[PDB]
Amino acid sequence: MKIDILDKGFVELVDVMGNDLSAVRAARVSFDEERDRHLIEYLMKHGHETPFEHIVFTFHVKAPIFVARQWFRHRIASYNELSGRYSKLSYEFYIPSPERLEGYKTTIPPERVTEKISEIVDKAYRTYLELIESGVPREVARIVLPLNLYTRFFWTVNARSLMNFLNLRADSHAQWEIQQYALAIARIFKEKCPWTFEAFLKYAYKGDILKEV
Amino acid sequence: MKIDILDKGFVELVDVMGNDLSAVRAARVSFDKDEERDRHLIEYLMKHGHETPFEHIVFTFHVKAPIFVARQWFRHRIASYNELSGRYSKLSYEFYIPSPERLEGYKTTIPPERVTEKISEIVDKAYRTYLELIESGVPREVARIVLPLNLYTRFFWTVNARSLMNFLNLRADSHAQWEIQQYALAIARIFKEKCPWTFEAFLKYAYKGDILKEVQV
Amino acid sequence: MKIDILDKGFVELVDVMGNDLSAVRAARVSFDMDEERDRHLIEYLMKHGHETPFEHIVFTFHVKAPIFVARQWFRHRIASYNELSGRYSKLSYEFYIPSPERLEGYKTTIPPERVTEKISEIVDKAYRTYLELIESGVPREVARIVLPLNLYTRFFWTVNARSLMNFLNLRADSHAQWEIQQYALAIARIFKEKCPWTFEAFLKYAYKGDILKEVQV
Amino acid sequence: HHMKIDILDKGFVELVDVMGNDLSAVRAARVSFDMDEERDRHLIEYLMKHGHETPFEHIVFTFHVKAPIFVARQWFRHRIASYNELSGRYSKLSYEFYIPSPERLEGYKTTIPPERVTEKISEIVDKAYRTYLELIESGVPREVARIVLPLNLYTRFFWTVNARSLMNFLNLRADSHAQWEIQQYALAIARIFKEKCPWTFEAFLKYAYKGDIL
Ligand SMILES: O=c1ccn([C@H]2C[C@H](O)[C@@H](COP(=O)(O)O)O2)c(=O)[nH]1
Numbered sequence: 057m058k059i060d061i062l063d064k065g066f067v068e069l070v071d072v073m074g075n076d077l078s079a080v081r082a083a084r085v086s087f088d089e090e091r092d093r094h095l096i097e098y099l100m101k102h103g104h105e106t107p108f109e110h111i112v113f114t115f116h117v118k119a120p121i122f123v124a125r126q127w128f129r130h131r132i133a134s135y136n137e138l139s140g141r142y143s144k145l146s147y148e149f150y151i152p153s154p155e156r157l158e159g160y161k162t163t164i165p166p167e168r169v170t171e172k173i174s175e176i177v178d179k180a181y182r183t184y185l186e187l188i189e190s191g192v193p194r195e196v197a198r199i200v201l202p203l204n205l206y207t208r209f210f211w212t213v214n215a216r217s218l219m220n221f222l223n224l225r226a227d228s229h230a231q232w233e234i235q236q237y238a239l240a241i242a243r244i245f246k247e248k249c250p251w252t253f254e255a256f257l258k259y260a261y262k263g264d265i266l267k268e269v
Numbered sequence: 270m271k272i273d274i275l276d277k278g279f280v281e282l283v284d285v286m287g288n289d290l291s292a293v294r295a296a297r298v299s300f301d302k303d304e305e306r307d308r309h310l311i312e313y314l315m316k317h318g319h320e321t322p323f324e325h326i327v328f329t330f331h332v333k334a335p336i337f338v339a340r341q342w343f344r345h346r347i348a349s350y351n352e353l354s355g356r357y358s359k360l361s362y363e364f365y366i367p368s369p370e371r372l373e374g375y376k377t378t379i380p381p382e383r384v385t386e387k388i389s390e391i392v393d394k395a396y397r398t399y400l401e402l403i404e405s406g407v408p409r410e411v412a413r414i415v416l417p418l419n420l421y422t423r424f425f426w427t428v429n430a431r432s433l434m435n436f437l438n439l440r441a442d443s444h445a446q447w448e449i450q451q452y453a454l455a456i457a458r459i460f461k462e463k464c465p466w467t468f469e470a471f472l473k474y475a476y477k478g479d480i481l482k483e484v485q486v
Numbered sequence: 487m488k489i490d491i492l493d494k495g496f497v498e499l500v501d502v503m504g505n506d507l508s509a510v511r512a513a514r515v516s517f518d519m520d521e522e523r524d525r526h527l528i529e530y531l532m533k534h535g536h537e538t539p540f541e542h543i544v545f546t547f548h549v550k551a552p553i554f555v556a557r558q559w560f561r562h563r564i565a566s567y568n569e570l571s572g573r574y575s576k577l578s579y580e581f582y583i584p585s586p587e588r589l590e591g592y593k594t595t596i597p598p599e600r601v602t603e604k605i606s607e608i609v610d611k612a613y614r615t616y617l618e619l620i621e622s623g624v625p626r627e628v629a630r631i632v633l634p635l636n637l638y639t640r641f642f643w644t645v646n647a648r649s650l651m652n653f654l655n656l657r658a659d660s661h662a663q664w665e666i667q668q669y670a671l672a673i674a675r676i677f678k679e680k681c682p683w684t685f686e687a688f689l690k691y692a693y694k695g696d697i698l699k700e701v702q703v
Numbered sequence: 704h705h706m707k708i709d710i711l712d713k714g715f716v717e718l719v720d721v722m723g724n725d726l727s728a729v730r731a732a733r734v735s736f737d738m739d740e741e742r743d744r745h746l747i748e749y750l751m752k753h754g755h756e757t758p759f760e761h762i763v764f765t766f767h768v769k770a771p772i773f774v775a776r777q778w779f780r781h782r783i784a785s786y787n788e789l790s791g792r793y794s795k796l797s798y799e800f801y802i803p804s805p806e807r808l809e810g811y812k813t814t815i816p817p818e819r820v821t822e823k824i825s826e827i828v829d830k831a832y833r834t835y836l837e838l839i840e841s842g843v844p845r846e847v848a849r850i851v852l853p854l855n856l857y858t859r860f861f862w863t864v865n866a867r868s869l870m871n872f873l874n875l876r877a878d879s880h881a882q883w884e885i886q887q888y889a890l891a892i893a894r895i896f897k898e899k900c901p902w903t904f905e906a907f908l909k910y911a912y913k914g915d916i917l
């Protein structure tokens with residue numbers, strides 16, 4: 057299962073451990089859908105979230121560094137990112153679409169903003185390649201690359217922690233770009249743990265965009 | 270996979286996510302096998318202290334053990350726990366009674382046999398009043414306070430590979446109480462079975478303990 | 487600053503780093519940044535869910551409590567602990583003996599004075615056997631298993647303000663066992679005494695328990 | 704408090720607050736045994752020797768750091784810590800970037816002279832910043848306009864970390880195998896750690912420090 061985000065990014069499921077029943081089982085400490093469904097809802101409305109920690113996912117994410125810097129602030133998880141200082145960086149940058157400026161009245165046409173961003177990316181990237189060819193080590197040359205440069209990482213997180221992620225990132229106050237990734241994460245999560253997801257939206261979700269998608 | 274520990278405890282594998290290759294893919298940041306090179310990478314990561322890739326291998330265990338063992342176990346914070354509630358459940362007549370062989374190598378003023386008898390007696394008495402209290406109408410959360418530390422409890426433990434190795438370093442060591450050493454050995458066996466390459470690399474480059482290299486599996 | 491809990495327990499403040507303004511500094515950095523606004527800033531953070539700035543306030547408490555209380559307390563993983571060892575020290579004769587009032591509000595087949603009496607009996611027999619075992623040469627780590635969960639233990643707790651507020655939401659709640667509720671009240675008071683604005687803001691916008699909105703400090 | 708060390712061309716590491724010291728570790732450790740300058744210190748060495756690191760968690764520090772984003776990203780990977788950072792989506796970012804000096808290139812035979820590399824990095828940074836300012840004045844949201852800024856832009860953050868976690872940070876960053884720039888900041892953190900917790904620090908170097916530059 058893979059979901060494309062922004063112009064060249066993505067979120068794909070690598071592996072998963074357990075399902076809704078994993079939480080049920082842990083809550084009873086042992087080893088009827090209606091009996092289980094109801095327990096899941098019971099645990100969710102009373103704030104008993106530890107049972108949901110026994111469900112874990114591993115995602116493979118392709119995102120712009122500026123989205124990554126926000127994403128990595130979630131410490132109750134595991135990460136492994138590509139090493140920019142020990143591998144030639146690919147020519148992958150996030151170039152917003154003109155619809156990204158929609159709502160904002162700017163001095164210049166949104167499509168012009170799109171153009172200026174591409175320009176910087178190119179000059180920056182060329183300077184980079186120029187630096188490497190000259191013999192300047194990667195760890196140094198890449199420091200002139202912009203924040204929209206794409207990076208990839210593996211993310212392992214438990215269900216409780218994932219729900220913490222969505223409360224903060226699947227919300228209109230978060231930057232739009234990461235919101236998009238959050239929706240993708242939300243969808244994959246819903247697929248693997250429908251019961252836990254249903255209950256989350258109803259009693260614990262503090263966000264606002266999932267209640268409308 | 271279920272292993273018996275002590276007189277009434279056990280270690281059982283509930284679930285597991287990934288294997289040795291999960292660390293390999295995590296380190297390369299590529300979602301796609303070459304034994305030689307994969308194993309070589311595992312050893313490399315273990316040898317240079319790059320433990321983050323191993324956090325992508327996760328286990329969920331179901332454990333039955335004495336409370337005095339759980340208290341030491343629960344000290345490992347990078348893990349998830351779910352234990353039976355004594356304040357929300359009638360506890361079962363199950364306690365750890367050390368075998369006479371447990372005081373072997375110790376000079377005592379009474380036969381090891383007597384120690385077992387003394388321990389078994391108080392336990393029996395303590396449990397007795399606990400029941401009298403329950404029938405009497407005394408709330409469980411209050412009635413169970415007269416129950417000794419050797420009472421058995423059960424929990425679910427979800428821990429990633431890295432954190433599990435750190436557990437082995439401290440518990441699968443002769444300096445840890447004998448009773449928890451037994452559980453760590455059981456953990457190690459299951460760990461060895463699921464991630465053989467990582468385990469071997471662990472023993473070879475990072476394990477700080479002293480028993481996992483003198484006792485098979 | 488020491489507060490007595492139960493019959494022989496306590497909550498004592500060992501050290502503290504920062505205060506309400508520590509959280510103010512942190513949050514400021516975000517906007518490249520007062521005075522009376524600082525107090526209003528704290529409410530802004532508390533009400534809109536910006537908890538990270540409070541992680542910069544830290545506490546170290548010295549706590550004496552029954553083991554059955556310590557075990558629930560230690561479940562809070564975002565903190566640091568160091569406790570009295572039952573295998574490295576000769577445990578002292580000190581157990582939690584509920585007062586008759588503890589049952590007040592419960593129909594009991596036997597008088598509260600009786601329940602109270604039965605607990606003491608077990609405690610005494612258990613400790614009795616404990617000393618006998620020790621006297622006989624039985625290692626401390628084994629001998630203590632006959633001791634009940636109402637035995638008092640001591641530990642140091644270092645935790646930040648955000649994690650502390652998390653502890654209060656859960657323990658400073660009538661759904662938690664009465665014994666730990668009492669400890670939570672002492673912790674709440676000390677926290678109120680060191681970070682009045684943060685605490686005040688806490689009860690008003692983020693506190694999810696009940697007892698702290700009816701009980702003072 | 705007070706302590707401040709300058710790093711690179713425009714960065715720094717400032718000690719904001721500290722809780723406890725060596726004895727804090729001694730005390731915490733003592734509790735286990737229900738329990739002298741000579742003995743207390745011998746204990747700290749004992750704890751380090753055998754790896755009993757829990758006691759050092761009762762020593763906490765609060766730092767104020769100003770460093771380029773590429774260094775900060777590496778830094779934020781340390782999870783047992785608290786952070787608060789300058790927001791690129793909430794404030795107009797200043798014209799401050801890490802410009803490697805010519806000597807940073809020493810040891811490397813490069814086509815164009817080091818001075819030149821410095822020049823070219825300065826130029827690209829200048830164009831990127833001007834485009835950033837241009838889009839800002841044009842009404843483009845800050846969170847969107849700052850995406851054209853290079854990774855050598857300076858950021859600022861507060862860092863609250865305990866001594867054990869701090870020794871963990873040094874084993875990885877206080878090492879020649881880590882980028883030079885992170886090494887410099889790591890060396891600064893170590894200096895302050897040393898000043899405030901001599902015994903713990905000195906024992907660290909002797910029985911646990913897995914690095915090679917301290
Ligand atoms: O020395 C290093 C190199 C890499 N990374 C992690 C930091 C980033 O999260 C990601 C990209 O690193 P760079 O190689 O580009 O610095 O990998 C580190 O923590 N330390």
Ligand SMILES: O=c1ccn([C@H]2C[C@H](O)[C@@H](COP(=O)(O)O)O2)c(=O)[nH]1
Pocket residue numbers: 352353354355356357554557558559561661662663
């Ligand atoms: O109110 C409660 C009940 C249970 N537990 C956790 C504590 C122990 O780790 C385990 C068993 O607790 P008891 O119910 O026996 O106290 O579950 C708590 O933290 N708080």
Ligand SMILES: O=c1ccn([C@H]2C[C@H](O)[C@@H](COP(=O)(O)O)O2)c(=O)[nH]1
Pocket residue numbers: 337340341342344444445446569570571572573574
């Ligand atoms: O080998 C040991 C000794 C102590 N402790 C921690 C466990 C408890 O939190 C407290 C008291 O332990 P006991 O010595 O009573 O087991 O210290 C351990 O985890 N392992």
Ligand SMILES: O=c1ccn([C@H]2C[C@H](O)[C@@H](COP(=O)(O)O)O2)c(=O)[nH]1
Pocket residue numbers: 122125126127129229230231787788789790791792793
């Ligand atoms: O919505 C936000 C804003 C800030 N930050 C954290 C991310 C960085 O560590 C630092 C600055 O982020 P930017 O505002 O530049 O994205 O604060 C987030 O995680 N999410």
